[PDB]
Design a protein around this ligand. Structure first.
Ligand SMILES: *CCC(=O)c1ccc(CC)cc1
Ligand SMILES: *CCC(=O)c1ccc(CC)cc1
Ligand code: NA
Ligand code: NA
Lengths: 494, 494
């Protein structure tokens, strides 16, 4: 049961959020956000820049002062706040799911059942951590009492992408606030609107002014300003591997702020010949085509053992052809538009390269409608490791299928990448599953499943897919500064 | 109770250490290392560069291959090897302490009783951690079994300074080898020798070839290669704030290698009027002058409450005036030379800048011997926050004393710094101690003591003093890459 959507949700928040209040840009400039299903403008959004960032940072810094309401708040009370935020998001679930679909493209059924569910679970999970991340008492040599305090790192710049706008917001807010940090957040120009509404809910929830601030805007301006700022203690960036580096340099060239990065992947999904065929085919399809293919951990190299190759391919093409593209508000739609024109054209370029370099186009391969950024579910077979479509992250509904013979071979070919976000193994065999999950150089390895996240389990890259981890207990490490206090005492006993 | 030193220890090791063998610089070039007590050359040392770093990295990478001896070795056996290495270090304690003194300048008694003791304690502490740094089993939603593996980060570049040559090598190797990493280490040009000899003990202990590689050389060459290398997974830099920016830029410019940094400080040592006067005077002395003032966490801003300012200053002058400078091989020597000429002149400069900006010079202030780099114990009085000697890391035997009135005041002034390495508080009052330790923005806060380190207690900077921690459990975090494995299972039960 999905409650019926409002296919035209009214927009309420479209400005910069600072000190629990709404501001136009300093320059008064706006930019359009666009509905990728129709190509038409939804509304204008305040266009933040350096000066707006500086207003947000000073707001946050003030919120972070020794003695402020946020700093003195009981850790248990931060929990309550996060729990109240989640209740509010839940009250407004159908609206936020409709708005996510309107501005992003994804099916409203998915927005509602998946994105919004995972937002709630994320926020409620972290609410639980607020008062449970303990420091240590340490049995140091000599007559001393030594312990650590887990303090907040402070003013946290967070730059989130457009593929999962509300969920990426929650993944960043949950850990930061659970541990008492304050936030200056930069949301994607393609998908600003849902994050702004949540900001209104944050105010309603009762978070003190300045604890969360949001600056919609462009990357070269607003985002770069956050990364370079001399008073930002910590930046967390999610996006392309290419900009990831820009952020890391900016951090090194500014104030040596702490960095974490969740970046691209070219994740291998390995189907052993003993896999369950029906399950493997459907999971491999999910693995690649989920969210219009716009997933950092998309299963974009489907390695299939040669004995089952032909059948797997045949069944995969049939599933891709049956995949319904269209109005993301229609309950029947499995696939909406790509997020924007730039992505749309990038994907068509990658398809052209797939054709040029000699991979076998098995279905799709072109535009799927006359209006909106819709692309046909596309499958390439007989892909080779040296092909462009086997190396570069396409971020679209384009599936690559590669054939392999042995477990030793597929390990080397899977791991032959500068990426290492995720991987999967499909097999009935205990030893093969253990061999592969150990050998694969990836932040997450799924076994007989794909895209299984929990707020409980960490997620993040090996290699150039990023550094550090989000979710679980690990997600708090980057948001904590550790202070050691070591006190002379009269005479230590055990 | 110390064994008599050999005041001219033979040098056995002066080359580049790769795959458990000794190699000349590819370029055949060498460099001098100098005995700072006499200014004379001790011996020549292979001059490593980009090409030798590349060799070390390939060696390390090979030792790290899945299925190799190091990767297959039982966690508990990595522990055995660290313990055996510490045993070898203890066998050769008397020699290593003399060699440290000859190359560094620090008094031999201190080398023996402090440096070598802490080296042994650190390696032995980390040997214990080898089989105890657990991943997690995680109660994720749904019919899944989810768990994390704590895997080694991979090839780790490690760059270490000249102030505590052996100890800094131990603080680096301990956590890295305990967690199954491989190492390419650059030692300081001023103090290459002790670490190269330990390299021999590492071979002797039975570490597989390629697991530790040491390339001596210069910063702009050997150091930068490491920082920039496409196949180094992680770099740890200890040294100056200046080079720390170079490292983080070079990592973002290269392969997005993980980074930790331990940089400079200007640490506040705060004396409340209720302090134990004799104790606080001697501790404030130790806090500044220990190791010829060459400690990243030197108590180089001594704040003293106005009501006791005069006597404390007075009492400090008498202690600074009787601090035996001399041959560091003589058991009475408290202070040896600074480590080299460049440092030697920088410190004299800072002392000029000090007179010339209106601090009161209360004792010493010039050279202390005609031969070598001996400076006189130097105390400035009536120092102010604005002056250069109150802001800039001097790294020599020059003590600043400043005056304050209130606890609220001293907090603001203590914290007004781009640094945040260490701080201390001397007081008899419970509430003052707790108020200050909370309020001070520093990685380590000592109460009624100074420079108290335990292998068990983490250590590292706030703000621009660095990021990441060394020592204790937390010292393992930067050396571990977290893999999540998430397995479909028939039906999860609690
Ligand atoms: C980088 C995060 C990402 O792309 C992603 C992929 C899938 C899901 C749920 C299936 C969440 C986030
Ligand atoms: C940064 C490490 C350092 O300077 C230091 C200072 C003192 C000691 C022992 C008292 C160890 C390391
Ligand atoms: Na949009
Ligand atoms: Na030397």
């Amino acid at each position: 049961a999905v409650p019926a959507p409002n296919q035209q949700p009214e927009v309420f928040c479209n400005q910069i959020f600072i000190n629990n209040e709404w501001h136009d840009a300093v320059s008064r400039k706006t930019f359009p956000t666009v509905n990728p299903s129709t190509g038409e403008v939804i509304c204008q959004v305040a266009e933040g820049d350096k000066e707006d960032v500086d207003k947000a940072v000073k707001a946050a810094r003030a919120a972070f002062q020794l003695g402020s309401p946020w700093r003195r708040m009981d850790a248990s009370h931060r929990g309550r706040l996060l729990n109240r935020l989640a209740d509010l998001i839940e009250r407004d679930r159908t609206y936020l799911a409709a708005l996510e679909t309107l501005d992003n493209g994804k099916p409203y059924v998915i927005s509602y059942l998946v994105d919004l569910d995972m937002v709630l679970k994320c926020l409620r999970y972290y609410a639980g951590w607020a008062d449970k991340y303990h420091g240590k008492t340490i049995p140091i040599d000599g007559d001393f009492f030594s312990y650590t305090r887990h303090e907040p790192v402070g003013v946290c710049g967070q730059i989130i992408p457009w593929n999962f706008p509300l969920l990426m917001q929650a993944w960043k807010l949950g850990p930061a606030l659970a541990t008492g940090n304050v936030v200056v957040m930069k949301v994607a120009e393609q998908t600003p609107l849902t994050a702004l509404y949540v900001a209104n809910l944050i105010k309603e929830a009762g978070f003190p002014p300045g604890v969360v601030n949001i600056v919609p805007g462009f990357g070269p301006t607003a985002g770069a300003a956050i990364a370079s700022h001399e008073d930002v203690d910590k930046v967390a960036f999610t996006g392309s591997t290419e900009i990831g580096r820009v952020i890391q340099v900016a951090a090194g060239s500014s104030n040596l702020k702490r960095v974490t990065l969740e970046l691209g992947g070219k994740s291998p999904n390995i189907i052993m010949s003993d896999a369950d065929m029906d399950w493997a085919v459907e999971q491999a399809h999910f693995a690649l085509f989920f969210n219009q293919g716009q997933c950092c951990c998309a299963g974009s190299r489907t390695f299939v053992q040669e004995d089952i190759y032909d059948e797997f391919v045949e069944r995969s093409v049939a599933r891709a052809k049956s995949r319904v593209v269209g109005n993301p508000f229609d309950s029947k739609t499995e696939q909406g538009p790509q997020v924007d024109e730039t992505q749309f054209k990038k994907i068509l370029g990658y398809i052209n390269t797939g054709k040029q370099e000699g991979a076998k186009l098995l279905c799709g391969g072109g535009i799927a409608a006359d209006r909106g950024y819709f692309i046909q579910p596309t499958v390439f077979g007989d892909v080779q490791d040296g092909m462009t479509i086997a190396k570069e992250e396409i971020f679209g509904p384009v599936m690559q299928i590669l054939k392999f013979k042995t477990i030793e071979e597929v390990v080397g070919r899977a791991n032959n990448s500068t990426y290492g976000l995720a991987a999967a193994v499909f097999t009935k065999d205990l030893d093969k599953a253990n061999y592969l999950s150990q050998a694969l150089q990836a932040g997450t390895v799924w076994v007989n499943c794909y895209d299984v996240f929990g707020a409980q389990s960490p997620f993040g890259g090996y290699k150039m897919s990023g550094s550090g981890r989000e979710l679980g207990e690990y997600g708090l490490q980057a948001y904590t500064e550790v202070k050691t206090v070591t006190v002379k005492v009269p005479q230590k006993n055990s």
